[PDB]
Amino acid sequence: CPLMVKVLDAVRGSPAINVAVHVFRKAADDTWEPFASGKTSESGELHGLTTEEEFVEGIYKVEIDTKSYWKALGASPFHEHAEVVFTANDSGPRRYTIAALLSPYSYSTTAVVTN
Amino acid sequence: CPLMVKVLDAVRGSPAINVAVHVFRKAADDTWEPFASGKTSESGELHGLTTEEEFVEGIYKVEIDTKSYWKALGASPFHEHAEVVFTANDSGPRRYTIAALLSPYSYSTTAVVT
Amino acid sequence: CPLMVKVLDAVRGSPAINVAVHVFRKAADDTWEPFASGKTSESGELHGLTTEEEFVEGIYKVEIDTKSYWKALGASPFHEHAEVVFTANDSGPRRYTIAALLSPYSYSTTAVVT
Amino acid sequence: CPLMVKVLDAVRGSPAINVAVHVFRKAADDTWEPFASGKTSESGELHGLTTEEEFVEGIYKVEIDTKSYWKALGASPFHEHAEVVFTANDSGPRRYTIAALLSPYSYSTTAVVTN
């Protein structure tokens, strides 16, 4: 599994469950084409998004929408979207893990490249 | 000033100077229309992007070009930019300050409204 | 002002007002000696904690009392405070700005030196 | 395993390996007594810190020192220490996971309480 995504909720302190996450790859003319997508499991992770064969170097974007989310402590009209754009490079390690921590008016994201 | 941006560098514990920032607004046909852009000052701040009249209601995307910043420092960054999409002025005018904290493999963005 | 503090509330997208902050300095016998304290303003800033002469070289601990802040808003916080320990003025005087971003179950702290 | 600790490196984008992490519990007179400690594994995690029987409600502190760390991209005289103080409550979920993301002049931490 070359690309994994982990989503956490910063106000409830739990995994972000049943959250839709989309992954796009940049096209030649600079369009974003759909690459892979799914919904986070009960541990806030999303596995089997792609395979080693399909995941080649290029520019990818991981998008997470927090609109539906939060009827928890803080709802807001902000409608924040996490947008993580990065370049997959065959030079560094093989496996990537993208983590996103969500709040109503903020979000942080990190990348852990192992193996 | 209704829309300000502030960038901090968590590697050298200083403001992020000369960073390029682009702001887009979502068009009726789902495309992203250029709205405003500029670069941060020596204090890491970017003011005067737009005015009260130009900043209408809508879905905006703020892109901070972190890759160029880290490479010009010798670092090997993971991300192309630090981005965040949000809805603004949905209930009349408000003042926004988007603040970003940067590291080679991580970043966060926060909004302070009015 | 050589030591400033700035706190932001990521839940309501505003500065964190009236937040208590304590600063300690590590004593020769490893105990933590009270150094300065105060509360953030309506802008979420705390200035005038100390002066250039009082702020000597040493290991300081800045504690932001987040629990009291979240409970007074009705939230159920995880942490007692947001804390961070660091070494200061080890190479002559410098100006520090510690900025903190708060959420009920998470927080970050960043330092901007001179 | 009631209390787990995960440490990540924000400049190298990898798990923080062989990092010493200490856990203290607050004593009656407000002293901090040693509770548990160890060194992060090759995946940046630390397991088997304590047991359900030993981990009762109270105020705990998880400390991580970044002094030795970083002969990686950015070394600094800052000598930052992550200090995560929290109260364990038997009301919320049973398992706690404390995550810490380190940088030379900054750090963020989150808590994920499950089950």
Distance CA A49, CA A15 (A): 18
- Chain C: partners with 3+ C-beta pairs within 8 Å: A, B, D
DSSP class per residue in A24-48:
EEE-TTS-EEEEEEEE--TTSEE--
CA–chain centroid gap for A88, Å, is: 14
The domains of chain D are located at: 1-115
Q: Which residues on C lie below 8 Å from D84 (Cβ)?
A: 79, 83
Residue owning tokens 């921590």: A101
Distance CA B62, CA A71 (A): 26
Neighbours of B95 (CB within 10 A): 13
Is the CB of A112 less than 8 angstroms away from the CB of D14?
A: yes
Neighbours of B114 (CB within 10 A): 10
Of A13, A110, A112, Cβ closest to residue D113: A13
| Best mutation target, D57, D64, D81, to test chain C (most C CBs within 10 A) | D81
Distance CA B69, CA B44 (A): 12
Q: Could you give the 3-state DSSP secondary structure of residue C67?
A: helix
Q: Give the contacts of B2 (CB within 8 A, at least 6 positions apart).
A: B50, B51, B52, B55, B93, B94, B95, B96
DSSP 8-state assignment for residue D94: S
Give buried/exposed letters for C32-48 (b at 16+ CB in 10 A, else e): beebbeeebeeebbbee
Closest chain B residue by Cα to residue D15: B105
Q: Could you give the 3-state DSSP secondary structure of residue B80?
A: coil
Token readout for C7 is 């706190």
Burial class, B58, CB count within 10 angstroms (exposed 0-12 / middle 13-18 / buried 19+)? middle
DSSP 8-state assignment for residue A77: T
Class of D1-115 in CATH: mainly beta
Of A10, A43, A110, Cβ closest to residue D8: A110
Residue owning tokens 């005087």: C93
Q: Which residues on D lie below 8 Å from B78 (Cβ)?
A: 13
Residue owning tokens 């490249």: A113
Strand-strand pairing, D106-114 and D3-9 = unpaired
- Amino acid identity of residue C10, one-letter, is A
Token readout for D6 is 């995960």
Give buried/exposed letters for A76-114 (b at 16+ CB in 10 A, else e): bebebbbbbbbebeeeeeeebbbbbbbbbbbbbbbbbbe
Structure-determination approach: X-ray
CATH number listed for the domain at residues C1-114 = 2.60.40.180
Biggest CA pair distance of chain D? 43
Closest chain B residue by Cα to residue A31: B31
Token readout for D20 is 């010493």
Closest alpha carbon to A97 in A25, A53, A46, A21 = A46
Token readout for C61 is 């601990």
